[PDB]
Amino acid sequence: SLPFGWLIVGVALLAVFQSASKIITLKKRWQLALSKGVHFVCNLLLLFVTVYSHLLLVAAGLEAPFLYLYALVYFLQSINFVRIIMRLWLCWKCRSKNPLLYDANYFLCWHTNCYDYCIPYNSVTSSIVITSGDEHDYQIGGYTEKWESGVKDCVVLHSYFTSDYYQLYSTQLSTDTGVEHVTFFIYNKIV
Amino acid sequence: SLPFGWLIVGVALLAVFQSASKIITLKKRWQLALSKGVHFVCNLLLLFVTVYSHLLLVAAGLEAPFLYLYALVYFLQSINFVRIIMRLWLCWKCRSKNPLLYDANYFLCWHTNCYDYCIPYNSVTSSIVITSGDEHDYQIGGYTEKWESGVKDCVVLHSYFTSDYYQLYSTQLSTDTGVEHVTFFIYNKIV
Amino acid sequence: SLPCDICKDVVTAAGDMLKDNATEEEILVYLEKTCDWLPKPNMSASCKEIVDSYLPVILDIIKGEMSRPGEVCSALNLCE
Amino acid sequence: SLPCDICKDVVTAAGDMLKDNATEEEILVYLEKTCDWLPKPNMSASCKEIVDSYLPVILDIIKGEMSRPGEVCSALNLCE
């Protein structure tokens, strides 16, 4: 008593959302939000399709040769869900939704009275350079955040588990480098 | 004369590869290669499943209400294929496979007799900082590349279309900043 | 610039094919059928109000979007 | 550290359940059935040589991998 057309329509929707997801650029903030929403809808469609196909195999008594496979599909998805559970919590650690929008391994956060800056970062390095300038803005590795408040002497790189604190040593104004309207802040990792 | 179990097994394989793909980290080089391979296998499974479901709908004469939808699935996928076609070509522009491994918007390349450095980068900024040091290595925005040769006075940020050339203005050794065993190279965009 | 050629050709072709008046009637029929098969009992009023009122709005904003092939192609990373 | 608890428990449980000798026999039967239903006519020799020779190799490398729950959990970003 389960309509098979549901499996085909779910497969079609999943294919549509997978095809659309891989063609969305990640330049602007709305593009990142749209990509994340499409990925979420695709994940929901994947769960629906897997559950329905498990409910059709069990309805026809054909689940025995594939049951283990479906368990894997659940187990990995469980990890996926758990992964999402960290990301949301990571957001609360920096009070920014950037961890949801970006898939970066680490996020360099620093908090002020005005704003909570959270810029993506790839790996724990011994030094971090923040470039401020050109309305001005901060950026690291091409990742740009809007300038709202000043700069702090102690920034922190967050993963889910690790939290590495960097202290500002030197500041490079547009007099010691020649790059006009640009300031460089250099942070060193604290042991 | 088409075995429907193929649709179910393809759906199961596609679900397995989608579930596995989203749980692979992107820290090490082998992890990135494995993620790209899993994404490729997932794309192949998606094409196979969509084509087979189109061949089952047409076999039962039920393709009319869904035909347009499938066209979309093809069209977006066509764009996807075209996108891949750029990435490979982008690789040839920098003679590195990093554009395949990384999904970054731009890639900062510079070529020497020994090696062709290609480091991911998010956006075209007015200045770029390259940090060299700690066996030493180069890194930008946490993206690390192994140190093989020296540094050049003219690096270039490649997209598929754009190519922005940056010239080195200032060098910050470990005497003007205090960050030991670390050197900073500052490049400004050329108008 | 080769991908731009095909991208602009495709988007202009889409704008030209959507320029037909019968396209609007087909879209309205499809929208009615969309809530005709839905299990929601209030979907008929939802379509008959929102779709009947706002379909020409989406039709005209697609007109405005198709007048700039370069912009829509740039949004897909197929152009500048 | 809560995800690490469940991750280490799961991987140790997998190592314990795979520790059974009957698990190897079941894996060998599954491997034989894998090429038993395949359309390739040379798959029988392929299994009878490669799988029969190298199944204990994968079994023992899984042994070595399960002795370090922290490492395998770290590989999945479930731990340090």
Numbering used by the authors:
A (entry chain A), B (entry chain B): 40 to 173, 181 to 237
C (entry chain F), D (entry chain C): 1 to 80
Q: What does the publication say?
A:
However, we observe direct binding of the MSP1D1 with SARS-CoV-2 Orf3a, which is unusual and may inadvertently stabilize a single conformational state of the protein. To circumvent this and potentially capture a different conformational state, we substituted MSP1D1 with another scaffold protein, Saposin A. We determined the cryo-EM structure of SARS-CoV-2 Orf3a in a LE/Lyso lipid Saposin A-containing nanodisc to 2.8 Å resolution. Its overall architecture and conformational state are nearly identical to the structures of SARS-CoV-2 Orf3a in MSP1D1-containing nanodiscs, harboring a TM constriction and a basic aqueous vestibule (global RMSD 0.50 Å). We observe a direct interaction of Saposin A with SARS-CoV-2 Orf3a, which occurs in a similar region to where MSP1D1 is binding, but with a slightly different interface of SARS-CoV-2 Orf3a. Although we were unable to identify another conformational state from this dataset, the discrete interfaces of interaction between the two scaffold proteins and SARS-CoV-2 Orf3a, with little change to the SARS-CoV-2 Orf3a structure, increases our confidence that our cryo-EM structures represent a native conformational state of the protein. Comparison of the SARS-CoV-2 Orf3a MSP1D1 and Saposin A nanodisc structures reveals several differences which can be attributed to scaffold protein binding. The binding of the Saposin A to SARS-CoV-2 Orf3a directly occludes Lipid Site 1 and consequently, electron density is absent from this site. Instead, we observe a 135° rotation of R122 into Lipid Site 1, where its side chain is directly interacting with Saposin A, creating space for a lipid to occupy Lipid Site 2. The rotation of R122 side chain and the electron density exclusively in Lipid Site 2 supports the argument that Lipid Sites 1 and 2 are not simultaneously occupied.
